[PDB]
Amino acid sequence: RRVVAHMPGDIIIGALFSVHHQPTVDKVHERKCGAVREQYGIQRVEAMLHTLERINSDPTLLPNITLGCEIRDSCWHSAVALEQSIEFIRDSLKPIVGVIGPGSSSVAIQVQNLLQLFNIPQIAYSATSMDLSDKTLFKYFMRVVPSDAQQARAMVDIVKRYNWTYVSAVHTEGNYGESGMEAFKDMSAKEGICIAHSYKIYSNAGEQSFDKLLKKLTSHLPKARVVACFCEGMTVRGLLMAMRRLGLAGEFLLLGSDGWADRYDVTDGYQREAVGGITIKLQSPDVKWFDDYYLKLRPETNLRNPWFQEFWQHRFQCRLEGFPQENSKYNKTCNSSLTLKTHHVQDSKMGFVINAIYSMAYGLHNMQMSLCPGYAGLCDAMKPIDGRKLLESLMKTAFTGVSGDTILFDENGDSPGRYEIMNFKEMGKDYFDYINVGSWDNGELKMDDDEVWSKKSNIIRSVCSEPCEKGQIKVIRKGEVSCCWTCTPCKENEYVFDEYTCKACQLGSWPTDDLTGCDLIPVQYLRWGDPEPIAAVVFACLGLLATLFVTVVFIIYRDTPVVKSSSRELCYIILAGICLGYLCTFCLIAKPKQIYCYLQRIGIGLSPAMSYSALVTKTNRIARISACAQLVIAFILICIQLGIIVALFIMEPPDIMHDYPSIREVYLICNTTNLGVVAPLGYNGLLILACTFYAFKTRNVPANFNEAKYIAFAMYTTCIIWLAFVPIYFGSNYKAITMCFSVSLSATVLLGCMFVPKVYIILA
Amino acid sequence: RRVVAHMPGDIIIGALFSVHHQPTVDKVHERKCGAVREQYGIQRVEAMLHTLERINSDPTLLPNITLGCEIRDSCWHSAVALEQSIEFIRDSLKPIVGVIGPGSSSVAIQVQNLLQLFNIPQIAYSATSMDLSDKTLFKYFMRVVPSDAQQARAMVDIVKRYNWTYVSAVHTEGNYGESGMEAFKDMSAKEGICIAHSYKIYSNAGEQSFDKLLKKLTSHLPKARVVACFCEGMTVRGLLMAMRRLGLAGEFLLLGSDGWADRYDVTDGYQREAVGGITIKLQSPDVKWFDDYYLKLRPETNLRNPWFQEFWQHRFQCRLEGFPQENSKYNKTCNSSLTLKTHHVQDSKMGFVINAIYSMAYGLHNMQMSLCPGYAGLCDAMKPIDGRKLLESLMKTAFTGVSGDTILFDENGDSPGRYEIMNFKEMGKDYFDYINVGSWDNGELKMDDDEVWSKKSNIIRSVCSEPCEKGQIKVIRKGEVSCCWTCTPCKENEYVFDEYTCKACQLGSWPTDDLTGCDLIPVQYLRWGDPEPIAAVVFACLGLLATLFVTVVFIIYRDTPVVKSSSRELCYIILAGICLGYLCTFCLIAKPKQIYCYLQRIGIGLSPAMSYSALVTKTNRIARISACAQLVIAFILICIQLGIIVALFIMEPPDIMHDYPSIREVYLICNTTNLGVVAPLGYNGLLILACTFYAFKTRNVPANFNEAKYIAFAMYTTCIIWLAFVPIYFGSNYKAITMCFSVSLSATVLLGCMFVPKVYIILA
Numbered sequence A, B: 001r002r003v004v005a006h007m008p009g010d011i012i013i014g015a016l017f018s019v020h021h022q023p024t025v026d027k028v029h030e031r032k033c034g035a036v037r038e039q040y041g042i043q044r045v046e047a048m049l050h051t052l053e054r055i056n057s058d059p060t061l062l063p064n065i066t067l068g069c070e071i072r073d074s075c076w077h078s079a080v081a082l083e084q085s086i087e088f089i090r091d092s093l094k095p096i097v098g099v100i101g102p103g104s105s106s107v108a109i110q111v112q113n114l115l116q117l118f119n120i121p122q123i124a125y126s127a128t129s130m131d132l133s134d135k136t137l138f139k140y141f142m143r144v145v146p147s148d149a150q151q152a153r154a155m156v157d158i159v160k161r162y163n164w165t166y167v168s169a170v171h172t173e174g175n176y177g178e179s180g181m182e183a184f185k186d187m188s189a190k191e192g193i194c195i196a197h198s199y200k201i202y203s204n205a206g207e208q209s210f211d212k213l214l215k216k217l218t219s220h221l222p223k224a225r226v227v228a229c230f231c232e233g234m235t236v237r238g239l240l241m242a243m244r245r246l247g248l249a250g251e252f253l254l255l256g257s258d259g260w261a262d263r264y265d266v267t268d269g270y271q272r273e274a275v276g277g278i279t280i281k282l283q284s285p286d287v288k289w290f291d292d293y294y295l296k297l298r299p300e301t302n303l304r305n306p307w308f309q310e311f312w313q314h315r316f317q318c319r320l321e322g323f324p325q326e327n328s329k330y331n332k333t334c335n336s337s338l339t340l341k342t343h344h345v346q347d348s349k350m351g352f353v354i355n356a357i358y359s360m361a362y363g364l365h366n367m368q369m370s371l372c373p374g375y376a377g378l379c380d381a382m383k384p385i386d387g388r389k390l391l392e393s394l395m396k397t398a399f400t401g402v403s404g405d406t407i408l409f410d411e412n413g414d415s416p417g418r419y420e421i422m423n424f425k426e427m428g429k430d431y432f433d434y435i436n437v438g439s440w441d442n443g444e445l446k447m448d449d450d451e452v453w454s455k456k457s458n459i460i461r462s463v464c465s466e467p468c469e470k471g472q473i474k475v476i477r478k479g480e481v482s483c484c485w486t487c488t489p490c491k492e493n494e495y496v497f498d499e500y501t502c503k504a505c506q507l508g509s510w511p512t513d514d515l516t517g518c519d520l521i522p523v524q525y526l527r528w529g530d531p532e533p534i535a536a537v538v539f540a541c542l543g544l545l546a547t548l549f550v551t552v553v554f555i556i557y558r559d560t561p562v563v564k565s566s567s568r569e570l571c572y573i574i575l576a577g578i579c580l581g582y583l584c585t586f587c588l589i590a591k592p593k594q595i596y597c598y599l600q601r602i603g604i605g606l607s608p609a610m611s612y613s614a615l616v617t618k619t620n621r622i623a624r625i626s627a628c629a630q631l632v633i634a635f636i637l638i639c640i641q642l643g644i645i646v647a648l649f650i651m652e653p654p655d656i657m658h659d660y661p662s663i664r665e666v667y668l669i670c671n672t673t674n675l676g677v678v679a680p681l682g683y684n685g686l687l688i689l690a691c692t693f694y695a696f697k698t699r700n701v702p703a704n705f706n707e708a709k710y711i712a713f714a715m716y717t718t719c720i721i722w723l724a725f726v727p728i729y730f731g732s733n734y735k736a737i738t739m740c741f742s743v744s745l746s747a748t749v750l751l752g753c754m755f756v757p758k759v760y761i762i763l764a
Ligand SMILES: CC(C)CCC[C@@H](C)[C@H]1CC[C@H]2[C@@H]3CC=C4C[C@@H](OC(=O)CCC(=O)O)CC[C@]4(C)[C@H]3CC[C@]12C
Pocket: A528, A529, A534, A537, A538, A586
């Protein structure tokens, strides 16, 4: 048999209150309800009764109308409340005008599926699930609380604001938890906040199952600190019970929804484990007049509540033997001086309960004012109440409740509301309490951060992978989530193109410090400055000094026989070639200009061509033993090389090319090919070997102060140096400087061992 | 008002059949049902009536018991069937003993929530959703069909077997579609089969919504070919209607669940778009006796079915004016010769309907046999039927139905069943039909693949990312799914370590062809063989020939004055040093052995030390102008270098080190340091310069056939070559061969310009 609270009157308003707990497993089939509760139960029942009394005793709302009610124990279970709603609709086969629908969303849905057949409009006070906005399915559902879509938004705001990224997610099995979790999940997926593993559990579940759940949560412990427990009360309670049963007290943070809102009974005796826990409550002020009424209640007086005796038994663990509930299970007969004000905790959500009953009354008020304005009472139009007419009234109904705030309904029967955020911290010596921290309103999340933790070093932020981008090290996806990643450093060639991808620079470019992108390498020019460059400079300087020295001497001493006898013009050609050879040094060490790159090859070809051509003519003159045709012979042999140079310019212009020894170094050189080097060098070398042969053949002529002898000595050394500097130009990467040394030393040897002895004799 | 089919009798068995369609949007509030159906409707109704007739007319099952029934139109909608079930339980305030519960799972759940309060056991025939296995929530639910957990397994088997990986997923809004999709999703996540984007839609949804859904499916078209439509009939119907309304006829494959099982009406007039489509039906054989009964039905005769007239109206679009349903909406009065056998399509699932009613009867049979065996009929124990006793009977009940198969229930009220797979292909000239392809049973998926497509080139397999592992190119996760990846090639240094990660090899190693891992590089040894190596070999050969030549000559001609005059012993020291210098060539070109690496440095130090030491003593003898102390001087100068070599061996042993010019090439050399090279070379060079000075100072002594003259010439050339081969050893990477050339040519020059002229004179 069932127990029914009821107040008589004209118009009856049903309600479903979770007076008892849900039945446990292996009791759900008998449907025998658990232990009583006040804050979800008796408190709400007395709230309804006294609110109905107030509306009876107010001439403003519904004059000449005595409102009645029927309170049914929902027992928080789906089937139980469904049976109670059947007991409501028994009359529709006094008729109930509408209900103040049950707490949990799943139970609400189950009840409304029945109710909307009989056109009985349901007003919720706690059933916050967002799938109840679908007025196609749920025509008769108007809750005075916001949808938990906003609540999932608030939770995602919190986990963004405190940088939690790799979270665990437990939600209660049932429509509230499931729908709310789905909303939180997709919002988090959008806003880039991953979830380790979504778990689900019944509230009445086994301790074994709770322990399994807790171990599964343990399997993500070092990273997934905070649990996004979009849960309900007994779910969180069972979780904390499991935490103590494994002794994992101050292990990890959890973050609860309004199932855990402000409730002490879910933390009672398990306080040490919900520490630091963050919660979201719907913003409801205290109800002072209800306090005044509720605290003056006595079990000997409150006859009209058939649960009140049993509650009075339970709260004080005592017995009223002389009263209709002995409860022989207990002992220690009740002290007559017991009060409710001792540890009175006012329910959070019961403001909404008063608002809901107000909404029902105001709806009826609007209906009365519409259909029969000039008749205070039940006219002929309201003998049977049209449910749809009542709905039309209720959807348009507005007022201010005990909170004083405007109570209006949108197109979804969802009244707007705020949200408060509590932290469950310590106050003093093991006196733990929730305390208001911040508020959420339409996206606006204001919050006192320093209040949380009482310490600027917070809980370990639930991050799977540390921001390993130290300017260098990239993100490596193993394929788990978009928040778990290993890390690989980019190479010195490799700039961090993106978090995910790291493209290298190309040749001619090099990455910056922080590896954003490419740059340009400080290329080397090697003009005036640097040791080795300037080394050849001083060499060429000494060479040019000796050049001018011997030149002036041989100009002045033209009259002398020892100078006059030999071919002075051919000697002048030698001197000019030698001087141009020294100019080749300064032509090579230059800024990489096009005209310079031209003149380099010009010099390298022509000036040794000049020198060895005039020398081969001299060796011919000294060997064969025309006097004005020797110049013509030299002219021919020079113009061949000049033609070769011009033809090679026709073939390929020596342009200005970036050099790449490796990535780290880039030069800017003349793009003289191997053929362009070797071919004029080949012609020069062949002339060298030719004059070598013709001089070595006739080395035994001691004429003109051993002219041929010194020339043969010069030719020996000359050929040795030319053969020595063969592989060096090919092997080196400093090819220009090698060419400088080679040709400059060649001209040096030629001068020093042809004309310097003659000068030494002519001035000795 | 509502319409009730009923057969009178002793025991009444209720049932919910989807006679009409569901109400459309903006009709769901009036709850006015759509158009009639036979295959889900009238066919099933006649099935129940005739089955009840058979069980009445069978003396075997339940003798002296006239079974009755009440058929209620479910209308496929949740609320409608809920109202009908209220109309069932009106008596419980003839009592219905149990129902043959409605088609869809969501409606089944809604009905059972009501029924289990009144202890009325429900047997389903189509409500395949897996969440109905939870006997905690659903104590009174026994379906004669398997759970769709197996069906999701079958679908995942199919999408594995045909290598579909990147699929789209539409499921019907409602518990069947939702739960089945969840099962398919997590199984696919396990078995590595991704889903593009899960969509959901009501069946009665707007054409706008269908078009939105279709465009959202279009947004994944080139990759996500196959849609895993875990849907229901009208969902698939609306999808095909949208396909024609966008004219996207043969666009993409879909894969349907048993909502789409074998139904023609879901493809009727939209046949061209479900082409190639693959479906899963529960394996049920045809029912011949039902065929015989059903086809002989006449609208003038079938009074007992109050839907049959309206169905007869609908199927032929005609009118029976003289009969209680005129249907003035239609025209074209019915031909009296119309038959049902014209386009008779037998329902698939109605075998299960017959089995379900059989199960109810057999359960009652077991209950009768248990409680009152010796009284054929209703005893005192079965005046009111105990629902729980009936459940206990039904959970243990076994039989063989019209299919002939064993009908047993597990602990979950889920009878085992098979699955058949159809393809919706063409037969001929636009005559389209489903045809059986394969079967699924307990994991065993056998299937005729070649039958599908009639072509070995199938539909484009739904793959987001082609297997770009061509032995070279890796997987790059952009963070979408574990099936969408871009691709990056590994470098030549980089072996494919894994699909996700690609680690390079280290120095001393190199990747293989297919880039599995590292190998060992074929290192170079350069012993006998190769041009440049053997070049120095022939050089040393000619040198040793000349060595022995001059040696034998100076041994024989010891008696001669020109040989006798000079220090023969010191000359012998020169010759020995020179010969050891030639041995240095073959010591350098060797396999990299430790003793060899020792002897290399030994030779390079000592043999030029010997040569230049004996030469400096000779220059001292020839310059200062002791006779047996010259040997002692040479011994001192040699032992200094020998001490240096031994001390350097003490400092660092020249061990055998792998060379790294770059990654691609590795040599195996002696690890002679720069100091270990230069220091003995430094001592040698200082001796060279010393004897150079002492010889150049005294170059003007023409004694002993210009001995000092040729020696000075030798020293000139010697010093030039030593100074020439300075940067080459440092610049080259072929350092050993350079050292060979250098020291061998040095010894060559020394011999050729000291002792060869003396031999030429003594034999001229
Ligand atoms: C003091 C020294 C050891 C260090 C700094 C060397 C340079 C700043 C000087 C010293 C000699 C100079 C050169 C002396 C000879 C002339 C030739 C003459 O004609 C050119 O060859 C034009 C080319 C040019 O503009 O450099 C004037 C420039 C140049 C190269 C001079 C340019 C500047 C040089 C290289």
